[PDB]
């Protein structure tokens, strides 16, 4: 309802938003798309503007800030005069900035604070994860380095975490949003799809690191059948860590629901906790479209699932 | 009928029925009553939560303060005593004795800034007299004047 | 469902009934429901503070209407039928018919059918 | 703690609430399961909780006594109190490491975690290179305020952000300070201090503050125009009620009413202008107790009889200069001990100078004697 | 009540039955409608319903945990437990009429049966005349046990005949003597009676045994206290008071029923021939006596109460046969000297004219009347 | 003027109050327009407002920092502090 | 916000540094110096120079002797300056 841009309020000119986020994506995508006549031309939008986005919340009926990022790429039409953005919050700065760090062992919220140290990003009070990890010795991005040292506080019994941008990054974990919306309500349509695509019944641990930790974890063999699987990873060295990575990474396969909704929750965001019928479960994915007609499509799942793929 | 006035408002909040049941008169004149007692105890309780209309309320005020709680006291002697023990948190300069003394003792006082070295004098008047008995008054004073000065006293009616 | 019952209320008499025990006379789930049902259509729609917005009917303010004699009859017709079918027990309401007997003096008539009133399919696998 | 003495009109029981609503029907069931006793429960039990938890609380948190959050807070600002912040743990860290590595300002540095304990993280104040000693002192805090932070030496020793070159890390000495969140038992003690006390300046009261203010002296007594108007003497004693040495005495006065004197200083004590402050120590009578003491199963005579002793001294203070000690006072503070559990079971032949009577101060303080079982 | 286990056999499927039972036959067709489904399908359809109906019922009343009716008393009469049985509801009914009229007992009056609700029918258990006076009060009963009865005050209206000179029949008050018992409650009490041991009245089952009544803090026995096996159990409330008389009743009828008819022999817990009393232990009265002096304004009364709530306080933490502390009660006075809490002085200081610590002999302690000597 | 915090029991709900009431309810039916919901609801409703009306302007009184008109002034008068007063204006007229 | 103010704790008891601060709290007030008795009976004098070292002028020295020490009560009126009983306090300012 409201653009800002830098200074101006291009909310008059353009066709839809879509506001577009998944569980393991870069970064919260908003792909905006404008009609670029004199008015519009003048102002000369290049990649690097920053997009806020301003419409009604859901939850109080404020204009709050829904998005707050950077345009990535704009791409001009000259026939049709349409110039299409594709709006992306900070976390994309991180996903392509490539690093080395060496790191002792230590908790992944201690190793999120070092990084917006050493590259000066803002950040909240990180919540403590708890979770302790093994050295290692990164290469890929800074988001990518988030991830796997999230990866491994996930295995161990850590709690899911998630990194999200706004105006300062936010180590949101995935089952405290505010809200726990239900979408039977405005169930337009959908799609519960069930399978044995990534069930795991047993877990060989191999360990490739000394305390010769080795052992067999299966835990509903009798009911689907050891589909086993082998984790052969350096970072678990102990006992402890394998039963934990072990009982993280059990599942009943893949268990989802292609949510189609008639009305656009705008407050819902990946990993947030949301219910349809009794159950509760949580977005995988969510996808509105802020056309004339406000509209939302979800992709939510168990989060046993959750943590097996994703994590 | 109903007697209570919020029992009559509860009753016509319901569906209109009930015009000639004794049965649900009675029972919302009940609540109604309830409702009124609940309603004068919410007036008492805000006459508790200050020390000039404290009440009942004036134990909690005076063991606040420390003074000595006494029921057997007149309530307007126990309220002067507190408000008195009160304003004796800051600077002792004519106007702050003046009212301070004025308010425990209920009666008009003008500190009369005596022409001795180190005295001050404190003038009473009262329309109605005062008892034969204001010790108190001079304990008080004591208590509460700077140390380096002394203190003369006369009463009027 | 679990529906469940109630006390007796003679509209009659504007009293409760009660045993000679002195106990409120209870009735059963059907009973309890038509003595609801009697009790919404009575009550007024958006002025008994008590209830929400749901309970109750709009009868009452229809007479003041300058509608016509058949557009007073539908406005019944609806109001009725809105009014009685919120209750989970009620399955259907209509056959409503009027009789102007007076020139401007009305009786209606309806027929309320009730969740226990359906016919159900005999057949099994 | 203080509780509010509440009427009991304001603390009904449930029951009594639903029997004075029942008591108004007449000609109608009212057993337990009919309409009316069930109808009624409800709105006696709504009632009843309302009540209670409504105007008691409501009542309760307006005074000191007994407010626990914000409201506390609002009182004691209203009474001129601020509560105590936490504060953060600081010390210093001795790194280890090659010659010419610069460690920076905003460097973290933990001490050990394990399964049990996350790790108290350390945050240096300070950018610094190591010297010729291999070795380098810089300052530190702990990042999160609190008691947490106060670690032991040698406890700080691992580094969050691999620095080439650094070899080792350690803390020689405990980090101090680590101040925690005031306690609401001792904000509530220190607003209700503030409210009791008269706070006045240049009174009696005000005077003994201030020389409570001075370190050493444990108890101090006061005389208003002692030679005249104008005259102010101060009556000070040591940590145990006996005579204060002439250099504490000269500490107090420098404190109240230096009688030293200078063209703008002219004595800028704490006294007011034109007070003419002696500071002494007064004559002191002492009084022993002398009783046949019994004493309870755990505890030690001695200590019991010194904590006797302290208690009867802080009755001293009580004892004015110049006033009378009560024979029945020190039986009380004597028996006190025994309601209380305090390791006496019984006493008799309660005596104080070896008499049973009153004893009047011919304008001496009191000093703490002697507790003498016999 | 338990949901009841059933065998498989017992739940198995008519069309099952009817496969088994034609699963024999190979030559002749077995077409429904054919002759051999003829023969063999009802029988089938009366197995399985007889199977499912008949031997699961048989199996829910066989087992205690979900028998009902006349098998649940039986089940409790194994073990000894009967179900409460109900009362006929009891009363006086008044009549007033010409003084001639004579009234006989087995009178049949009745309630106002209407539309809504029948009459419930009531019979005289005695026979009176109105000769005396106009009005005559008469004993009467319900016909019908349970709770049906138990009407309001002027319930009772109607005469099932006529009697000659009767003016009114009123009940004056309402009935109370009507009661029904519950299927579910017997069957619990039948499943609360498993106790397997520590039966024999012991000092440790009588302890037990005054404890399970409500309102029993602690209890005590004393084992032939008057010979022959007799008992005493005494006992303290449950904030160590004297235990009231409708507790010690409630008690004694508990352990040891005392109201037993001719035709009648105890319930209680006690054993046969183990004799049992319930007693408390006497309630002291701490009296004080000192020569009080109060400060300046202060009420004495205000004082000398705050004082007696003060000492009482102290006293409810002595238990039976406890020490009353005298030299502590010296600091429960000298508390308010120290706190100046009215009180200026005392001397004198006694309890029930005492100077010394008391020690309580089957005695629990409570405060006495705090008196002012006020010595000439 | 700061804001004043509310416990959660002051602030509590209507309907929340009236499902506390009627949670006691088992065999008699609860609905809308029923006997029971005539009997209990303007309880729960008069409930919710003394509770959220009366109780908050106390609570509001209560304190200096939110005090007003003359409860403010009487807890100016704790403190020995009065407001200044009006005077009526003055001149001269030919 | 004036009963919120009226909340220090201590420093009340009109010393030398405490008359420096009241005529530091009056604006117009650079430096403040004090005489103890320079009249006896404990007067107090109350030496005060503007911002920019200067004699102060008539007006702030009366502006300072009304906060401090009012001149001007009537009889049914009371000091309510910063000085408290008993202190005499006057104004002044250098030649």
């Given at each position: 309802k409201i653009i800002l841009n830098?200074?101006?309020?291009?909310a008059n000119f353009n066709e839809g938003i879509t506001l577009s986020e998944a569980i393991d994506g870069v970064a919260y995508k908003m792909d905006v798309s404008l009609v670029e006549p004199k008015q519009l031309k003048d102002i000369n939008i290049k990649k690097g503007d920053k997009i806020i986005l301003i419409d009604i919340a859901y939850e109080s009926k404020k204009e709050e800030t829904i998005f707050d990022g950077v345009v990535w790429e704009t791409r001009r039409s000259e026939k049709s005069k349409k110039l299409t953005l594709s709006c992306r919050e900070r976390t994309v700065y991180m996903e392509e900035s490539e690093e080395q760090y060496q790191f002792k062992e230590n908790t992944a919220t201690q190793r999120i604070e070092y990084y917006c140290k050493q590259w000066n990003i803002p950040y909240y009070?990180?919540?403590?994860?708890?979770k302790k990890l093994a050295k290692v010795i990164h290469k890929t991005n800074i988001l990518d380095m988030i991830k796997k040292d999230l990866k491994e506080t996930a295995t161990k019994g850590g709690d899911l975490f998630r990194v999200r941008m706004d105006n300062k990054l936010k180590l949101f974990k995935?089952?405290?949003?505010a809200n726990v919306y239900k979408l039977d309500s405005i169930l337009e349509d959908a799609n519960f799809t069930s399978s044995f695509?990534?069930?795991?019944?047993s877990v060989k641990v191999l360990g490739k690191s000394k305390d010769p930790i080795i052992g067999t974890y299966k835990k509903d063999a009798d009911k689907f059948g050891t589909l086993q699987k082998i984790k052969q990873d350096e970072?678990?060295?102990?006992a402890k860590e394998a039963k934990k990575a072990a009982e993280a990474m059990f599942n009943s396969g893949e268990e989802t629901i292609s949510v189609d909704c008639?009305?656009?929750?705008?407050?819902i965001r990946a990993g947030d906790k949301v219910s349809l019928k009794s159950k509760e479960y949580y977005v995988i994915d969510v996808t509105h479209t802020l056309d004339s007609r406000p509209k939302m499509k979800l992709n939510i799942g168990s989060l046993e699932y959750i943590r097996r793929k994703f994590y | 009928m109903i007697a209570s006035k919020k029992g009559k408002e509860m009753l016509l909040t319901?569906?209109?029925?009930?015009?000639?049941?004794i049965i649900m008169q009675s029972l919302y004149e009940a609540i109604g009553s309830e409702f009124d007692n609940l309603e004068l105890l919410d007036e008492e309780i805000e006459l508790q939560l200050?020390?000039?209309?404290?009440?009942?309320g004036l134990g909690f005020w005076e063991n606040r303060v420390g003074l000595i709680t006494n029921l057997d006291e007149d309530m307007e002697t126990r309220r002067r005593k507190v408000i008195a023990k009160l304003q004796?948190?800051?600077?002792?300069?004519p106007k702050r004795m003046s009212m301070i003394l004025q308010s425990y003792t209920g009666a008009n006082i003008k500190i009369?800034?005596?022409?001795?070295?180190?005295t001050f004098g404190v003038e009473l008047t009262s329309t109605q007299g005062f008892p034969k008995d204001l010790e108190d008054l001079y304990k008080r004073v004591n208590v509460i004047k700077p140390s380096h000065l002394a203190v003369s006293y006369k009463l009027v009616s | 469902l679990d529906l469940k019952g109630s006390f007796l209320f003679d509209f009659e008499k504007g009293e409760f009934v009660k045993n000679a025990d002195g106990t409120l006379k209870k009735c059963d789930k059907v009973q309890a429901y038509k003595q609801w049902c009697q009790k919404a259509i009575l009550t007024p729609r958006?002025?008994?503070?008590?209830?929400?917005?749901?309970?109750?009917?709009e009868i009452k303010d229809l007479?003041?209407?300058?509608?016509?004699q058949s557009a007073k009859e539908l406005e019944i017709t609806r109001l009725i039928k809105e009014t009685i079918l919120?209750?989970?027990?009620?399955?259907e309401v209509g056959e409503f018919s009027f009789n102007w007997?007076?020139?401007?003096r009305l009786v209606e008539y309806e027929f309320d059918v009730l969740t226990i009133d359906d016919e159900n399919i005999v057949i099994d696998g | 703690e203080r509780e509010l003495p509440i009427p009991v009109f304001l603390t009904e029981d449930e029951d009594s609430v639903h029997e004075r609503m029942l008591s108004?029907?007449?000609?109608?069931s009212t057993l337990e399961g009919d309409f009316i006793y069930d109808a009624t429960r409800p709105t006696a039990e709504q009632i009843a909780e309302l009540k209670q938890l409504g105007l008691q609380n409501n009542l309760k948190i307006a005074?000191?006594?007994?407010s626990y959050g914000t409201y506390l807070e609002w009182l004691g600002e209203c009474k001129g109190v601020f509560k105590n912040q936490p504060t953060k743990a600081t010390g210093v860290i001795t790194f280890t490491g090659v010659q010419g590595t610069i460690i920076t300002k905003g460097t973290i540095v933990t001490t050990i975690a394990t399964d049990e304990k996350q790790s108290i993280e350390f945050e240096l104040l300070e950018t610094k290179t190591i010297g010729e000693n291999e070795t380098v002192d810089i300052k530190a805090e702990s990042?999160?305020?609190?008691?947490?932070?106060?670690v032991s030496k040698?406890?700080?020793?691992?580094?969050?952000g691999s620095i080439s070159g650094v070899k080792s890390i350690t803390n020689k000495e405990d980090f101090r300070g680590g101040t925690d969140i005031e306690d609401e038992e001792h904000f509530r003690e220190r607003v209700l201090v503030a409210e009791q006390?008269?706070?006045?300046?240049?009174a009696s009261s005000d005077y003994i503050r201030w020389a409570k203010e001075?370190?050493?002296?444990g108890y101090a007594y006061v005389v208003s125009?002692?030679?005249?108007?104008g005259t102010v003497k101060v009556l000070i004693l040591d940590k145990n009620r006996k005579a204060a040495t002439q250099e504490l005495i000269d500490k107090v006065q420098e404190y109240i009413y230096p009688l030293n004197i200078s063209?703008?200083?002219?004595?800028?004590?704490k006294a007011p202008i034109g007070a003419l402050v002696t500071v002494v120590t007064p004559d002191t009578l002492l009084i022993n107790v002398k009783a046949s003491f019994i004493f309870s199963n755990g505890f030690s005579e001695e200590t019991v009889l010194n904590n006797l002793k302290t208690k009867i001294d802080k009755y001293l203070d009580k004892i004015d200069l110049g006033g009378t000690v009560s024979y029945n006072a020190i039986q009380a503070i004597v028996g006190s001990m025994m309601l209380t559990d305090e390791g006496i079971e019984d006493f008799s032949n309660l005596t104080i100078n070896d008499v049973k009577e009153n004893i009047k101060l011919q304008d001496q303080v009191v000093g703490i004697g002697e507790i003498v079982n016999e």
């Amino acid at each position: 309802k409201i653009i800002l841009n830098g200074k101006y309020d291009i909310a008059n000119f353009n066709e839809g938003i879509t506001l577009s986020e998944a569980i393991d994506g870069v970064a919260y995508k908003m792909d905006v798309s404008l009609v670029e006549p004199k008015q519009l031309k003048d102002i000369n939008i290049k990649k690097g503007d920053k997009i806020i986005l301003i419409d009604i919340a859901y939850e109080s009926k404020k204009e709050e800030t829904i998005f707050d990022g950077v345009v990535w790429e704009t791409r001009r039409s000259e026939k049709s005069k349409k110039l299409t953005l594709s709006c992306r919050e900070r976390t994309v700065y991180m996903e392509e900035s490539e690093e080395q760090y060496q790191f002792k062992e230590n908790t992944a919220t201690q190793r999120i604070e070092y990084y917006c140290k050493q590259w000066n990003i803002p950040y909240y009070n990180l919540a403590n994860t708890g979770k302790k990890l093994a050295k290692v010795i990164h290469k890929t991005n800074i988001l990518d380095m988030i991830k796997k040292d999230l990866k491994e506080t996930a295995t161990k019994g850590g709690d899911l975490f998630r990194v999200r941008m706004d105006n300062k990054l936010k180590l949101f974990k995935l089952g405290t949003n505010a809200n726990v919306y239900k979408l039977d309500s405005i169930l337009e349509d959908a799609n519960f799809t069930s399978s044995f695509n990534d069930a795991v019944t047993s877990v060989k641990v191999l360990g490739k690191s000394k305390d010769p930790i080795i052992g067999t974890y299966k835990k509903d063999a009798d009911k689907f059948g050891t589909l086993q699987k082998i984790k052969q990873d350096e970072k678990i060295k102990n006992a402890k860590e394998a039963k934990k990575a072990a009982e993280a990474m059990f599942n009943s396969g893949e268990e989802t629901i292609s949510v189609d909704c008639a009305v656009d929750i705008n407050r819902i965001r990946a990993g947030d906790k949301v219910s349809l019928k009794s159950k509760e479960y949580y977005v995988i994915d969510v996808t509105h479209t802020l056309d004339s007609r406000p509209k939302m499509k979800l992709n939510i799942g168990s989060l046993e699932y959750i943590r097996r793929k994703f994590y | 009928m109903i007697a209570s006035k919020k029992g009559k408002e509860m009753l016509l909040t319901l569906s209109p029925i009930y015009e000639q049941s004794i049965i649900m008169q009675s029972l919302y004149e009940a609540i109604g009553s309830e409702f009124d007692n609940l309603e004068l105890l919410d007036e008492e309780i805000e006459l508790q939560l200050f020390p000039q209309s404290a009440t009942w309320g004036l134990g909690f005020w005076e063991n606040r303060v420390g003074l000595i709680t006494n029921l057997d006291e007149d309530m307007e002697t126990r309220r002067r005593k507190v408000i008195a023990k009160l304003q004796s948190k800051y600077i002792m300069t004519p106007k702050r004795m003046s009212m301070i003394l004025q308010s425990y003792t209920g009666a008009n006082i003008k500190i009369n800034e005596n022409i001795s070295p180190y005295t001050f004098g404190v003038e009473l008047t009262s329309t109605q007299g005062f008892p034969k008995d204001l010790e108190d008054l001079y304990k008080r004073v004591n208590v509460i004047k700077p140390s380096h000065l002394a203190v003369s006293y006369k009463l009027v009616s | 469902l679990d529906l469940k019952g109630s006390f007796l209320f003679d509209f009659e008499k504007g009293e409760f009934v009660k045993n000679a025990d002195g106990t409120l006379k209870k009735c059963d789930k059907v009973q309890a429901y038509k003595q609801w049902c009697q009790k919404a259509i009575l009550t007024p729609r958006y002025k008994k503070a008590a209830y929400t917005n749901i309970y109750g009917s709009e009868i009452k303010d229809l007479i003041a209407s300058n509608l016509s004699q058949s557009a007073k009859e539908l406005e019944i017709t609806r109001l009725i039928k809105e009014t009685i079918l919120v209750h989970p027990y009620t399955k259907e309401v209509g056959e409503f018919s009027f009789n102007w007997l007076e020139n401007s003096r009305l009786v209606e008539y309806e027929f309320d059918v009730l969740t226990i009133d359906d016919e159900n399919i005999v057949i099994d696998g | 703690e203080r509780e509010l003495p509440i009427p009991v009109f304001l603390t009904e029981d449930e029951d009594s609430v639903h029997e004075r609503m029942l008591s108004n029907f007449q000609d109608v069931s009212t057993l337990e399961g009919d309409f009316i006793y069930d109808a009624t429960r409800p709105t006696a039990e709504q009632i009843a909780e309302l009540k209670q938890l409504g105007l008691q609380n409501n009542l309760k948190i307006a005074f000191p006594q007994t407010s626990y959050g914000t409201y506390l807070e609002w009182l004691g600002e209203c009474k001129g109190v601020f509560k105590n912040q936490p504060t953060k743990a600081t010390g210093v860290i001795t790194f280890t490491g090659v010659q010419g590595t610069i460690i920076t300002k905003g460097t973290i540095v933990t001490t050990i975690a394990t399964d049990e304990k996350q790790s108290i993280e350390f945050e240096l104040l300070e950018t610094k290179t190591i010297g010729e000693n291999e070795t380098v002192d810089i300052k530190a805090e702990s990042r999160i305020v609190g008691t947490i932070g106060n670690v032991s030496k040698g406890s700080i020793s691992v580094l969050l952000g691999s620095i080439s070159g650094v070899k080792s890390i350690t803390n020689k000495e405990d980090f101090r300070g680590g101040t925690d969140i005031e306690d609401e038992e001792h904000f509530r003690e220190r607003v209700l201090v503030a409210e009791q006390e008269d706070k006045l300046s240049g009174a009696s009261s005000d005077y003994i503050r201030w020389a409570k203010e001075v370190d050493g002296v444990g108890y101090a007594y006061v005389v208003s125009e002692w030679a005249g108007a104008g005259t102010v003497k101060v009556l000070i004693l040591d940590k145990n009620r006996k005579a204060a040495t002439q250099e504490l005495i000269d500490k107090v006065q420098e404190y109240i009413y230096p009688l030293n004197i200078s063209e703008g200083e002219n004595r800028d004590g704490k006294a007011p202008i034109g007070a003419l402050v002696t500071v002494v120590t007064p004559d002191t009578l002492l009084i022993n107790v002398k009783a046949s003491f019994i004493f309870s199963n755990g505890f030690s005579e001695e200590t019991v009889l010194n904590n006797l002793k302290t208690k009867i001294d802080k009755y001293l203070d009580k004892i004015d200069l110049g006033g009378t000690v009560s024979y029945n006072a020190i039986q009380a503070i004597v028996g006190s001990m025994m309601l209380t559990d305090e390791g006496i079971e019984d006493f008799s032949n309660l005596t104080i100078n070896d008499v049973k009577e009153n004893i009047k101060l011919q304008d001496q303080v009191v000093g703490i004697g002697e507790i003498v079982n016999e």
